[PDB]
Structures are given as C-alpha cells and as structure tokens.
Design an enzyme around this catalytic site. Structure first.
Site, PDB file in Angstrom:
ATOM      1  N   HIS A   1       0.798  -1.235   0.000  1.00  0.00           N
ATOM      2  CA  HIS A   1       0.000   0.000   0.000  1.00  0.00           C
ATOM      3  C   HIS A   1       0.837   1.295   0.000  1.00  0.00           C
ATOM      4  CE1 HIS A   1       0.465   1.028   4.237  1.00  0.00           C
ATOM      5  NE2 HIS A   1      -0.015  -0.142   4.621  1.00  0.00           N
TER       6      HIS A   1
ATOM      7  N   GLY B   1       3.075   5.345  10.205  1.00  0.00           N
ATOM      8  CA  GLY B   1       4.486   5.268   9.872  1.00  0.00           C
ATOM      9  C   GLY B   1       5.115   3.966  10.318  1.00  0.00           C
TER      10      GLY B   1
ATOM     11  N   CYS C   1       4.078   0.975   9.518  1.00  0.00           N
ATOM     12  CA  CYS C   1       3.976  -0.044   8.471  1.00  0.00           C
ATOM     13  C   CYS C   1       5.358  -0.550   8.070  1.00  0.00           C
ATOM     14  CB  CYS C   1       3.261   0.483   7.242  1.00  0.00           C
ATOM     15  SG  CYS C   1       1.484   0.564   7.426  1.00  0.00           S
TER      16      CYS C   1
END
Lengths: 4, 300, 300, 4
Positions: free
Chosen positions: C41, C143, C145
């Site tokens: 993503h 952040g 991820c």
C-alpha cells in the site's frame, strides 16, 4: 539474599 | 493506537555484552571502549559472600584471575580496579561495537529496559521501573549478574542499572554504572529487607489519562482538590506525594483530554478513599503504576 | 524470580530495518540479502487507498519510483514485483547484516516480538500474541507499516508478521512475509470487523504455572475436574476448548511444579466462577493469555 | 481502517  | 509497555531496541547493548569468569563463578560484563564492568562480588567464594572484605579480596586477585570472552574470542585483562561495588577490567582491545553512551542515575518512578543475559549471551529484553523503595520487580535467575538496565535517546545509550542480587521478597537490587547501589543495600549475603514500597502516583495518573483516552471514563468526578490536600491523602494510602514537577509533566495529557491535573487528582483521591468496588479501569481492578506520562503521550 | 513480558533480543532484526519511500509515503522495509520487503500500500495515493487495484498501480510504477535508505546510505532499486500484499524490491547491495532467517506463518495462540519502527529506524520492542480472531493487540502509530514480528530459535530469526493497518476497534492486521494476511482482512481503507475473540486457555494455564514457580500459590485448590467438565465451563466464559494435545504441552511444567494439568484446570475453573476478590496473580487481576508454555519455560 |  541471593547473589545472581 | 494500543497501549503496551515497550523496551528500547536492545541491539546497541547486545554488542557490549561479554562473559566474565572468576574461579567457579560465571556472570556477565559490560564492555565499553577498553573497559569491562561487572559486579565486584564475582571475586567472592561462597564463604566470602557472608562477610566480604572487598579491598582484601581484590588485592588477592590478579589480571589472570579473570577470564573474559567476547563470543568465542578470549580477551586479555591488562588492569583492574574497583569503583564502589563495580569492578573495572581494562582489556587489550576497544569494543568496535561501542555505542554512543552515558552513565546516568535513574530516579524512583522512572522506567528502563533490561537486557537479561546469561554466560555473556542476551536471553531477552523487558521493561520495568525503579521502585520508590529502590528495588526493581525484574525477572532474573542465577547467572544474570552483570545484566544492565538502560534507555536510548536518539543514538545514545544511557546505562542506568547493573544487576547484583535478589532480595527475600523476590525483588531485585543493583547499582548504577559507577557502582553505587540503588537504596541502602549492600553486596553481602546477609538478611536485607526492601523498605515498605509506595505507589508511583505520577504513573497512576498517566494511566488514568490513558484510560480516558481509550474511553474508560467512569472514575471522573467534579470535586476539587489542592496539591496539599491530595498529597495528604496519598501518603496515608502509601501513594507517593505529587510534586510541582509532576503536575508539569502531566501537562500534555491534561490538554489533550481537557481534564485538569488536580481534577484527575480529585478522581484518584476518591478511588483511594472508596475503592474500585469490582469496577475495572482498562480491564484491571488495580491501578497500574509502571506506565509513564511519556509512554502514554508517545502512544497517542 | 520475577516474571515479565519478555521480547527476544532485537539486534539481529535492527540491522535489517531500512526506510522505503514512494511518493509522499514513508514506511519501513525489511532488508534481507538483496531483497527489501514492505507493505504494497506504499504505492497508493490517498484516493487509491479507498478502492485500489494493486496490479494496475504497480505496472504504472518503475524502479526509480522507490527510494530505499539504509542509515543515510541510498540503496539503488534494480527490480520490483508483487508478493501478495507485499512488494519485493530488489536492490544492488546485499545486506551484510543478514542473519540466518526463515519465514513462518504463526498460529493463533502463539507469540512473537514486535520491532516497531518509524522512518526505517528501530523505535521499540514488545511481546505480542496472534489472537484466535487473527488480529494482534499491538501498539502502532502511523508510519509503523513494515515493522515486523519475529521469534528466535537458537541462531535463526523466524519472521512471522509485517504490519499493515489498524482496524476500527484499535486492533491490528498484517501479513506473514509472503504477504498473505492473517485473517479475513484486505488492504483497503474500508471498515473491517474481526470475528469475536476468545481467550487462549493454554496460555492462561501456562501463566498459572509461572505464578506457582514464582511463589504465588493462593489460587490453588484440591478440587479436580475432567477435561470435558473443564471445557464445559471454559466455553461459557469465552475460553478456547482445551485439547489432549494442549494437556500434553503443559506436561513439563506440570512435572516441574507437581501440579496435574487437570488440577490447574480446576484452579482456573474456580477463578473463572468466583473471580479473584482483590488479590493478584503475578501483580495482575487480569488472567494473562499472552505467554505460551514455551515462553514460560524459556524465562523460568 | 487506518493504514499505518
């Protein structure tokens, strides 16, 4: 008391 | 979202952990530049432990009396000294993995991370608090001596604790990295007792703010208190009095939730006087005191 | 003595963490050999996140669409492809800090350590469990991820989780290192529910053993139950049924403590039926289900 | 659902  | 007690990443500390052997005792050491720190009781025989004279015992030891291994390599001790309850071992090589570092003295109520080690090897990492009675509720087995407690600010490791011993209650005592014990404790195998512990009020208030943030709100009230009246109540329940600085520190959590610090104090006051009943805050019927204002702020 | 939430030493994982940027999105990447893994993503714009077509989005990108930074050293991307919900970015430099590793799909009930990262930089570590409803109760901010979950077996780092997203209830969803989500979840910015969660019975009992090993004994009784009669009560309180397989796993702990698994189950039944009455087990009023029998053994 |  035990010294590690 | 989500609230959890975290440890700092242990990597920078892992590269400083070594094995230290003296006679039949093996424990851990902290290797920084060309120095290795370890608890001075490494030199004691079982008999010495009972009534040690450390200056007498140390002079009866040499450099060759200490086996130091970094991985499979054996380091050469080229000088030794005692600094309070720590032993400093000068070695032939500077640790190339030496991080940027400081030696700080942690305050009661503050938190840190412990990298629990055995035989010079990292076993695991956990969070804990310096208790007001100057003990820690750690997790330690025989051989863990030399394990350090730390925080990391940017790229700088602040070592604050080195493990020495466990008390009869199962709590733990040790020193800073200058070898000064936390609390009145001594490196002697004799009856020592932790003083009566108190609850870290600053942290309970942080936790209550955290509870409000996650929508747990039943405990709020509209009573008023002063810092003086609250502290007077706190002390009769063995809660630490709250300082001016502590009010300051809860400032951000007060703004974010719109609940004045003294108003949360009024809530806590009522909790102490009446109890929880069987009611829960964040799933718990007891108040958490090892989760700091900084933990809560950071995690929102 | 003492029993703490304990994460594995995170050093080996830290030297694998890099920063991955696509457009105005920066998140974390896992760098192993000459490959960098991150959530796919990262290629989405705000509007894409709503109903993305990832194959479409990825063909419209190139090698220069991705910026990979290890420390302040820029890593040149020379290849890219989709690996389910992850991107595999091929880089021209092999990670010299690559540990022995493998990819594992963690089972509900099992635990792991999370290295939470921001801007490619290790921020904190904490122990976590895969819930029976295939979510994790983590502590994650925007952040984070690309932060990973891992276990260590001897020398080998087993990567099991990479962080993708937070659900409306505040819990977290992610993939294994092959990019397959745990649970029914999809990487789309749309409200998603998990199934009803249950309590990891096997872990609760393991934690009861840990308490006994650590001197907390108040909850023990001489009552005893059959597996069937225990499960009859377990499910009523939203606990997972306990199987003979699960009984066999608690064997070593049962032997070390001298407490029959079925006796500990009878202790749990009473705790479930009658609560705790203000008293605590290892400083907690909540029955803890995020320590496996293995976590107990390893720590004790 | 928030992407981190």
């Amino acid at each position: 008391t035990v010294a590690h | 979202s989500g609230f959890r007690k975290m440890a700092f990443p242990s990597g920078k500390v892992e590269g400083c952990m070594v094995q230290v052997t003296c006679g039949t005792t093996t424990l851990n050491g902290l290797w920084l530049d060309d120095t290795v720190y370890c608890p001075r009781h490494v030199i004691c025989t079982a008999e010495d432990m009972l009534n040690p004279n450390y200056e007498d015992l140390l002079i009866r030891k040499s450099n060759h009396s200490f086996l130091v291994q970094a991985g499979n390599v054996q380091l050469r001790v080229i000088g030794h000294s005692m600094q309070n309850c720590l032993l400093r071992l000068k070695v032939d090589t500077s640790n190339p993995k030496t991080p940027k570092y400081k030696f700080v003295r942690i305050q009661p109520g503050q938190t840190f991370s412990v990298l629990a080690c055995y035989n010079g090897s990292p076993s695991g990492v956990y969070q804990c608090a310096m208790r007001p009675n100057h003990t820690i509720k750690g997790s330690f087995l025989n051989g863990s001596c030399g394990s350090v407690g730390f925080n990391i600010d940017y790229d700088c490791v602040s070592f604050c604790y080195m493990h020495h011993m466990e008390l009869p209650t199962g709590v733990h005592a040790g020193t800073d990295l200058e070898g000064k014990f936390y609390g009145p404790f001594v490196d002697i195998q004799t009856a020592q007792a932790a003083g009566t512990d108190t609850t870290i009020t600053l942290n309970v208030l942080a936790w209550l703010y955290a509870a409000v943030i996650n929508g747990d709100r039943w405990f709020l009230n509209r009573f008023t208190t002063t810092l003086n009246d609250f502290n007077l109540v706190a002390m009769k329940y063995n809660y630490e009095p709250l300082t001016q600085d502590h009010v300051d520190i809860l400032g951000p959590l007060s703004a974010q939730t719109g609940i004045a610090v003294l108003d949360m104090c009024a809530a806590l006051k009522e909790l102490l006087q009446n109890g929880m009943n069987g009611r829960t805050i964040l799933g718990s019927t007891i108040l958490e005191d090892e989760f700091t204002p900084f933990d809560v702020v950071r995690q929102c």
